[PDB]
Design a protein around this nucleic acid. Structure first.
Ligand SMILES: [Mg+2]
Ligand SMILES: [Mg+2]
Lengths: 679, 399, 131
DNA sequence: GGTAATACGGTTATCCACAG
DNA sequence: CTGTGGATAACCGTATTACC
């Protein structure tokens, strides 16, 4: 039994029949033995101990008859990453112990993902025909459960891999697991449906099919790529939503991170506290995000790349603009959905009162797709969205009057306008990004280059170091000293030169051969209707706009319905201030809460709503009985209800609402450019 | 600047003036240079890194003139484990680099523990608690502790050599008895550069560590039988209504709660405690029911906290009986955000039933488990026989 | 001991605040028709309570209790029922004060609850003893 | 030379795309 | 061959008492 990690190894070792069943635990994900050379492939711990533990040799030196076991069962967890491993491993026994695979000795264990409580297991159709707990991994199952449901011969089911049409198998392991992304992506497009989908043999091709498809789809939709609307990946949305639900906002205390992480992993995000804290930290670093979404107290990283305080230390809390990412989430504005567990519902997208995806950016490594979208200036983005609200048909050159190019939080200089255009047109382009520098004439007569902004996502330490590395290797002459002078109130790298040293030469060699100047490649993929799309500035801005339409609309309906309800109650309270002594003597007349409501409804034609309201009143209320205040309430109610009705009804009314709010956000948060542009 | 690990090393590194200040991160507790073989003290990685960084040579080969720095500043987190590291480092300097401590070159840094304040006498005269330097932002660190203008630094000196070799060798010595004596004696359980003798620094510091590690960690309370971590676990679990009669709950949530609301320490320690509390070959009457992998008598590691769910057991219910009905002393927590009980109602005698074990400083504890029945027998007998002698009691509590 | 005591002091104090409130409630049913009317023109909640006190010798506990009664509860006017509650409360307050005053009733309870726990949870011996 | 249990620290290898 | 960021999985140094 091949098992991932030692915690699953525990459940296995304890559930197993110890006479004829072994367990080999595996640290992590297994090496892709179709993507790396036989060099690394043979120098790999897991691989090696796997060859050993099976004892029959790899490659052409493999003997089916020297094999220590009859069956080689891959029992990974039931989840996505489980499936991906079933893949990687299946593509190692195909590429290196093929006779094992061909002879029908590699099987795949089918443990369950869920379980019921009445107070019945779950492999979607018998969980309905028999009348929850999602298993993170094996180690969440108790040993007897593992045994009776998956490890026991008399009871278990097993999928039995067999190579049926050899050549086709070869083709498939090649598309899916090989080095060239292209055919893998075509395969996904052609096969994966992003909307919405004892012993028993399946072919290598089919098994590899389902498992990779499952991995691919989940990892595209639900991990790596952002939503084209709110611009967030699942983990970031879940962080914002859970923190906000817990009242941890900008206007209150800070709060110890590891509580937050514990909750986020308790309620929304079934993965390591590692990934969660990591994401939460990144959201707090003003040199990674252009507009930060989380404020953190304490060591939260730095441009040198030093580790943030481990999560036991650092206080955190939502920023202010994040609130604007979640405004009106309470007014039924956005699609919710059950979490992994079914304890709670969670949002699938946020209202997003500002256009995040273009402002903060996204990056970006999925499977078959990968995204890279630079940040922009909140002002400029809003300006374009607002022009496009009045001008659906707008062309790129025009919009670029408002959206000239990216605005990195790390400043610098961006060269390449035709390519910024190319990328806003198509989603893909290449641009150059160059550091800010002054030249500094020092005492004596020696010049000194002072770098003061560096390229986006460049490690400052690494850089300074790779420059001193140019010095001591005399890759060019000039550099007398290289010294990081950065501090509390600035970023300053002083490259001091010798007397007589071509400063222009040194500078150019530096831009050429170090990361003082790099390329940014746009690759703007986002999830737009459940499938990945490569998009220019237009489907992004459009998508945004229509989102805000839907949000505003559902909001206006929620408020209007609320309003109506209230109006319909006051309409009762007034017409019961009239027949008061009668209604009191009637509730006193009645017998028990239901007879009182039924009687309030029979004897004076109140509704359920109005009945419950009146009967559920308090005695101290009866003191104040002024119908003029109620009438003012009723009136205001009516005017509101009307303007709501107007927003829901009239289109241009709603688009102006959109623009007013947007211009309000812009006014509040507008910050000046940091990245200068050059053509 | 000697700092305790890379988390605090961050803030150190940032908030520092780079022209003259250096930062050496140490990875944990420093080795005790009194208790260890010279084989070990030789091989110890951090020891070597310090002996090179200070660049002067150890002990007998120590040349004061070759000191790369005028001041060697000790900056540990403000809490107790802090003071204990201060202690270990200090004895190392006393031992294998004496004339540095003799010249007054070894200074101790003074970070604040809380805010709105040092100590606990001046804070009461007025609220976050810095559980390690890594949740202090760099500006704060500079202003409060690293700025040669603003800061305050304890300035360690050997003021009477004879009266020093004793204290170090007693508080750090291999032999326990003299330490225990010292503790029983001195520990009561209930300014730009200030100078202080080694005797008094090592004194007050080891006093702090010892007192905390005895009172609030390693030894159990003679009434509910719990060490504090176990107590916050049962209390918090029960507050969230994570009880025996209601569907297990991802431990990894419970632990975040415990760390943020009650137990300001590393997840590791907390989850490990909760799990041991679920293992029925360690506990005679388990207090936590846990679901999934939670170890074996072979010791295979429990599933990590991401995996297993848990709830209180039924009988833990009784350990918590009537807690709501103002039946037990509460106190504020590390935050001053919430109240936690200081001892539980204990509707059975847990200290004898599940036992305890058992390592602090000067004291260790080993009390083996017993039968819940038999202990309850003896308890009832004693209730009607205040003066009961051991031999009669053993007719109920054989062993 | 300390626990059983303080627990008992808690249970008593609660039973008593209740008792007090129910006696109040009974009296309110007696003079019931003008309670309403006195509130009905009494400026506000505050002056409603003030007017209940400075006119009917009510207590603030009974006052806030009355004036914030739900309207649908003016259905239930059953006096004998509230009187039965009054009975049970009195018996409880008795027992509890007994525990607090008789340092022998208390210890007997202690024994009671301890043996209760024994029947609920006792399991057999496991490590055998040899000398 | 070993382990006991509650504390203090930190670290590494994998997949995925896409760049020079 | 390196780094990007959201995922998988492990790993081990130190203190403290105590006893062969
Ligand atoms: Mg370059
Ligand atoms: Mg690169």
């Amino acid at each position: 039994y091949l098992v991932e990690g030692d915690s699953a190894g525990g459940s296995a070792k304890q559930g197993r029949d110890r006479k004829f069943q072994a367990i080999l635990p595996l640290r992590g994900k297994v090496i892709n033995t179709a993507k790396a050379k036989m060099a690394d492939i043979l120098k790999n711990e897991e691989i090696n101990t796997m060859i050993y533990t099976i004892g029959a040799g790899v490659g052409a030196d493999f003997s089916i008859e020297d094999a220590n076991y009859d069956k080689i069962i891959i029992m990974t967890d039931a989840d996505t990453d489980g499936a991906h491993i079933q893949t990687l491993l299946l593509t190692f026994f195909y590429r290196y112990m093929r006779p094992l695979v061909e002879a029908g000795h590699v099987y795949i264990a089918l443990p369950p993902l869920y379980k019921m409580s009445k107070g019945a297991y779950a492999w979607d159709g018998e969980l309905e025909e028999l009348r929850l707990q999602r298993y993170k991994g094996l180690g969440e199952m108790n040993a007897d459960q593992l045994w009776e449901t998956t490890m026991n011969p008399e009871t278990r089911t097993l999928i039995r891999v067999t190579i049926e049409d050899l050549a086709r198998a070869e083709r498939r392991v090649n598309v899916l697991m090989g080095d060239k992304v292209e055919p893998r992506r075509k395969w996904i497009e052609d096969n994966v449906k992003f909307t919405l989908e004892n012993i028993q043999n399946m072919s290598l091709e089919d098994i590899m099919g389902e498992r990779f498809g499952r991995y691919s789809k989940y990892i595209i939709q639900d991990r790596a790529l952002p939503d084209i609307r709110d611009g967030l990946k699942p983990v970031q949305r879940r962080i914002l939503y859970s923190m906000n639900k817990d009242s941890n906002t900008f206007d209150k205390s800070y709060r110890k991170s590891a509580k937050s992480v514990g909750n986020i992993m308790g309620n929304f995000h079934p993965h390591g506290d590692s990934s969660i804290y990591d994401a939460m930290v990144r959201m707090s670093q003003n040199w990674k995000n252009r507009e930060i979404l989380v404020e953190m107290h304490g060591n939260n990283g730095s441009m040198d790349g030093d580790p943030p305080a481990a999560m036991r230390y650092t206080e955190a809390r939502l920023s202010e603009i994040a609130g604007y990412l979640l405004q009106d989430i309470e007014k039924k504005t956005v699609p919710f959905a059950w979490n992994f567990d079914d304890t709670e519902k969670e949002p699938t997208v946020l209202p997003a009162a500002f256009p995040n995806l273009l402002v903060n950016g996204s990056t970006g490594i999925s499977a078959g797709y990968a995204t890279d979208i630079p940040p922009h200036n909140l002002a400029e983005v809003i300006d374009a969205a607002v022009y496009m609200i009045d001008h659906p048909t707008a062309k790129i050159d025009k919009l670029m009057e408002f959206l000239p190019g990216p605005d990195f939080p790390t400043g610098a200089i961006i060269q390449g306008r035709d390519e910024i255009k190319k990328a806003y047109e198509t989603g893909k382009g290449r641009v150059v990004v160059r550091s800010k520098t002054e030249i500094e004439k020092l005492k004596g007569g020696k010049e000194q280059i002072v770098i003061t902004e560096i390229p986006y996502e460049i490690n400052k330490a690494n850089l300074v170091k790779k420059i001193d590395d140019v010095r001591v290797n005399n890759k060019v002459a000039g550099i007398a000293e290289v010294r990081d002078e950065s501090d509390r109130d600035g970023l300053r790298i002083a490259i001091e030169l010798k007397k007589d040293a071509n400063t222009e030469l040194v500078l150019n060699y530096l831009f050429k051969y170090t990361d003082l100047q790099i390329n940014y490649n746009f690759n703007m993929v986002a999830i737009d209707n459940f499938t990945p799309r490569q998009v220019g500035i237009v489907p992004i801005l459009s998508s945004y706009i229509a989102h805000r339409r839907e949000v505003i609309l559902a909001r206006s309906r929620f408020d209007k319905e609320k309003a109506e309800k209230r109006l319909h109650i006051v309409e009762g309270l007034i017409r019961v201030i009239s027949i008061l002594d009668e209604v009191i003597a009637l509730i006193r007349a009645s017998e028990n809460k239901a007879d009182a409501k039924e009687n309030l409804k029979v004897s004076y034609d109140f509704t359920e709503e109005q009945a419950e309201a009146i009967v559920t009143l308090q005695l101290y209320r009866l003191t104040n009985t002024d119908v003029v205040v109620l009438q003012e309430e009723e009136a205001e109610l009516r005017e509101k209800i009307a303007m709501l009705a107007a927003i829901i009804g009239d289109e241009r009314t709603m688009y102006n609402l959109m623009k007013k709010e947007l211009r309000e956000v812009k006014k509040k948060f507008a910050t000046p450019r940091l990245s200068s542009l050059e053509d | 600047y000697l700092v305790e690990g890379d988390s605090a090393g961050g803030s150190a590194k940032q908030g520092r003036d780079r022209k003259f200040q250096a930062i050496l991160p140490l990875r944990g507790k420093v080795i005790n240079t009194a208790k260890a073989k010279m084989a070990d003290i030789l091989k110890n990685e951090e020891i070597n890194t310090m002996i090179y960084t200070i660049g002067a040579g150890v002990g007998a080969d120590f040349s004061i003139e070759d000191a790369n720095y005028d001041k060697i500043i000790i900056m540990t987190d403000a809490d107790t484990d802090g003071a204990h590291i201060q202690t270990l480092l200090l004895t190392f300097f006393y031992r294998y680099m004496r004339p540095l401590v003799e010249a007054g070159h070894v200074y101790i840094a003074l970070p604040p523990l809380y805010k709105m304040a040092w100590t606990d006498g001046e804070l009461e005269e007025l609220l976050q608690r810095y559980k390690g330097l890594g949740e202090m932002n760099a500006d704060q660190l500079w202003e409060t502790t690293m700025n040669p203008e603003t800061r305050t630094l304890i300035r360690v000196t050997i003021e009477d050599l004879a009266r020093a070799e004793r204290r170090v060798n007693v508080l750090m010595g291999d032999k326990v008895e003299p330490r225990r004596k010292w503790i029983e004696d001195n520990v009561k359980f209930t300014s730009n550069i200030q100078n202080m003798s080694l005797e008094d620094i090592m004194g007050e510091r080891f006093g702090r560590y010892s007192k905390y590690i005895i009172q609030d960690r390693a030894l159990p309370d003679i009434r509910d039988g719990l060490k504090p971590v176990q107590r916050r676990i049962l209390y918090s679990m029960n507050k969230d209504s994570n009880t025996f009669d209601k569907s297990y709950r991802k431990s990894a949530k419970s632990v975040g709660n415990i760390m943020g609301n009650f137990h300001p320490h590393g997840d590791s320690s907390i989850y490990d405690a909760m799990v041991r509390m679920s293992q029925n070959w360690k506990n005679r009457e388990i207090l936590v029911e846990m679901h999934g992998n939670n170890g074996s008598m072979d010791g295979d590691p429990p599933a990590a906290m991401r995996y297993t769910e848990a709830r209180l057991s039924e009988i833990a219910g009784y350990l918590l009986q009537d807690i709501e009905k103002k039946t037990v002393p509460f106190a504020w927590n590390f935050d001053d955000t919430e109240k936690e009980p200081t001892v539980l109602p204990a509707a059975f005698p847990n200290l004898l039933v599940n036992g305890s074990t058992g390592i602090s400083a000067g004291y260790a504890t080993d009390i083996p488990p017993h039968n819940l029945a038999e202990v309850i027998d003896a308890a009832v007998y004693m209730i009607d026989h205040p003066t009961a002698k051991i031999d009669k009691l053993m007719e109920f509590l054989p062993g």
